[PDB]
Amino acid sequence: MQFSKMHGLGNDFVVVDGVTQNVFFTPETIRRLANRHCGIGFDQLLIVEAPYDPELDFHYRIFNADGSEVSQCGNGARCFARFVTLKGLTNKKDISVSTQKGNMVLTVKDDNQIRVNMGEPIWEPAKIPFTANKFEKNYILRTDIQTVLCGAVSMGNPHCVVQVDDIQTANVEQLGPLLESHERFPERVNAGFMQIINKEHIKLRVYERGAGETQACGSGACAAVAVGIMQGLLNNNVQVDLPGGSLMIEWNGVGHPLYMTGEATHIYDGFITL
Numbered sequence: 001m002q003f004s005k006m007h008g009l010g011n012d013f014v015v016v017d018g019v020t021q022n023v024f025f026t027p028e029t030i031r032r033l034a035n036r037h038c039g040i041g042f043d044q045l046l047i048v049e050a051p052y053d054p055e056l057d058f059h060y061r062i063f064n065a066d067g068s069e070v071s072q073c074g075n076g077a078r079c080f081a082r083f084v085t086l087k088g089l090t091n092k093k094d095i096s097v098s099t100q101k102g103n104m105v106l107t108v109k110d111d112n113q114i115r116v117n118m119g120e121p122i123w124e125p126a127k128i129p130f131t132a133n134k135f136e137k138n139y140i141l142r143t144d145i146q147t148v149l150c151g152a153v154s155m156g157n158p159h160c161v162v163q164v165d166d167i168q169t170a171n172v173e174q175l176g177p178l179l180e181s182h183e184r185f186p187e188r189v190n191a192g193f194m195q196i197i198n199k200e201h202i203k204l205r206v207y208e209r210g211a212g213e214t215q216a217c218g219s220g221a222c223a224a225v226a227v228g229i230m231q232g233l234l235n236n237n238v239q240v241d242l243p244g245g246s247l248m249i250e251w252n253g254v255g256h257p258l259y260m261t262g263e264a265t266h267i268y269d270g271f272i273t274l
Contacts, residue, residue, distance in 0.1 A: 001016065001021060001023060001271070001272055001273075001274075002016075002017065002021065002269070002270070002271055003015060003016045003040070003269070003270050003271075003272065004016075004083055004086075004087075004266060004267075004268070004269050004270070005040070005042070005266075005267040005268050005269075005270060006079040006082065006083065006264060006265060006266050006267055007079075007264075007265050007267060008075075008076070008078045008079050008245070008262065008263060008264040008265065009075065009078075009215065009216035009218065009242060009244045009245035009247070009262060010215035010216050010242070010243060010244015010245045011043040011044050011075060011214070011215055011216060011244060012041070012042050012043050012044075012267075013042055013043070013044045013045070013046050013076055013079050014033065014040055014042040014044075014045050014046065015046045015047075015048065015076075015079055015080070015083045016045070016046065016047050016048065017048055017083075017087060017089065018047040018048055018049040018050075019048055019049060019050050019058070019089060020089075023047060025045070025047075025063070025067075026067070027063075027066070027067025027068060028067065029067075029274075030045055030063050030065070030066075030067035031065065031066060031067045033045070033272075034065035034067075040270065040272065042065065043064075043065055043214075043215075044062050044063065044064065044065070044075060044076055045062065045063040045065075046060060046061070046062050046076040046079060046080060046083075047060060047061045047062075047063075048060050048080060048083065048084060048089065049061065051097070051098055053098065055096070056096045056097060056098050056103065057084075057090055057092065057095050057096050057097060058080070058084065058089070058090075058095065058096075058097045058098075059097065059098045059099070060076065060077075060080050060097055060098075060099060061099075061100065062075060062076050064211070069100065070210075070211065071099060071100035071101045071157070072157050072190055072208050072209050072210070072211065072217065072219065073190075073206075073208065073214075073216070073217040073218050073219050073220065074099070074104065074116065074118065074155075074156075074218045074219045074222075074260070075216060075217070075218055077097075077104060077106060077114065077116045077218070077260075078106075078113075078114040078116070078262050078263060078264035079264040080097065080106065081095055081106040081107075081108055081114045081116075081264070082108075082112075082114065082264040082265075082266060083264075083266075085108055086266060093107060093108055094106070094107050095107075095108070099156075101156040101157060102119060102155075102156035103119070104116050104117060104118065104119075105117040109261070112263075113261055113262065113263055114261065114262065114263075114264055115259050115260070115261045116218075116259065116260045116261070117257050117258075117259055118155055118156070118219070118222050118257065118258045118259065118260055119155070119156070119257050119258070120254075120255070120256065120257050120258065121153050121154070121155060121222075121223070121226040121230075121251070121258055122153065122154035122155070123135055123153060123230070125152065127154060128152055128153065128154045128158045128185075129158065129185070129186055129187055130152045130158060130160075130184060130185055130186075130189070131183075131184040131185075131186065132152075132184070137151060137230060137231050138150070138151065138231070139151070139152055141160070141179070141182060141184060143175065143178040143179070143182070144178060145174060145175075145178070146171075146175065148162050148175065148179070149162065149163070150162045150179075151226075151227030151228075151230060151231060152189075152227075153223050153226050153227055153230075155219045155222050155223055155226070155258070156219065157190060157209065157219060158185055158187060158188070158189040158190065158209070159189060159190045159191075159192060159219070159220060159223035159224075159227075160179055160182075160185070160189050160190070160191055160192065161192045161193075161194055161223055161224045161227040161228075162175070162179070162191070162192065162193050162194070163194050163195075163196060163233075164193050164194065164195050165195065166195060167193065167194075167195040167203040167204070167205060170193045170195070170205065172193050172205050172207055172213060175191070175193070175207075176191050176193075176207025176212065176213065177207065177212075179191035179207065180207050180208075180209055180210075180212075188209045188210065189209055190206055190207070190208050190209045190217065190219070190220055190223070191206065191207040192204055192205070192206045192207075192217075192220045192223060192224045193205045193206070193207075194224045194227075194228065196228065196233055196234065199233070199234050199235040199238075200234070200235050200237060200238050200239060201238065201239045201241075202224060202225070202228065202234070202238060202239075202240050202241070203240075203241045204220060204221055204224050204240050204241065204242055205242075205243065206220035206221075206242075208220070213243075214243075214244075215242065215243045215244030215245075216242040216243065216244040216245060217242070218242075218247060218260055218262070220242075221240040221242060221247045221249055221260065222249055222251075222258055222260050224240065225238045225240060225249035225251060225258075226249075226251055226258055229251055229253065236250060236251060236252055236253070237249070237250050238250075245262070245263075246262070247260050247261065247262045248260070248261040248262070249261075
């Protein structure tokens with residue numbers, strides 16, 4: 001099995017062409033390959049697959065190092081685009097891909113960065129889903145230790161975004177779990193904590209639905225900027241600093257799709273038996 005090693009936003013990926021090779025991995029195998037001392041070593045495993053849909057170019061799946069398929073964050077999208085380009089699986093500048101949760105369009109920019117069209121943010125509470133009388137720009141959520149204010153939005157998955165004064169001292173450790181499984185989010189939620197530096201720059205940490213905090217949750221960056229724009233606190237183009245790296249988010253408001261732009265880097269190519 002051929003593979004490539006890449007990195008983006010502070011995570012390292014193993015990327016596999018599952019279009020010209022037939023691959024399937026059980027969690028046990030994934031954990032073995034993810035092991036840094038006896039395996040290849042990675043944070044995320046990305047498989048590029050046939051779309052089984054004439055209106056799409058590819059499908060991709062991502063697995064964590066614990067061997068589970070995951071789909072909260074849209075991570076690996078930049079690596080996916082660079083990989084299919086470098087390997088000649090496509091030569092399209094605008095690439096349409098399905099994921100476990102919603103389609104994306106990936107644009108390979110002239111400066112080599114990758115722009116991902118994440119679709120239009122979804123604001124209606126019932127469609128997030130989130131239990132609320134009606135849409136509000138700021139919702140009041142009571143937890144065991146504090147009542148917080150948040151924006152709520154869906155990008156394919158549910159997000160709630162809390163503004164914090166100082167990103168390093170924000171109580172992600174206690175508030176993250178309390179929000180992620182809050183009763184008002186029937187399908188749970190990705191809980192983002194955003195420090196606004198200025199109208200074009202934020203810092204963000206995300207307690208991911210079913211996973212907790214990692215180095216980067218791209219869709220969390222999208223959600224935080226959408227919320228801030230909706231609230232009047234951010235402009236339409238914003239740099240987001242996640243723990244592991246930065247993204248540029250662009251959103252021209254209702255009626256328009258939201259875009260996320262960032263880098264992906266090829267490291268080496270490998271071959272493994274099994």
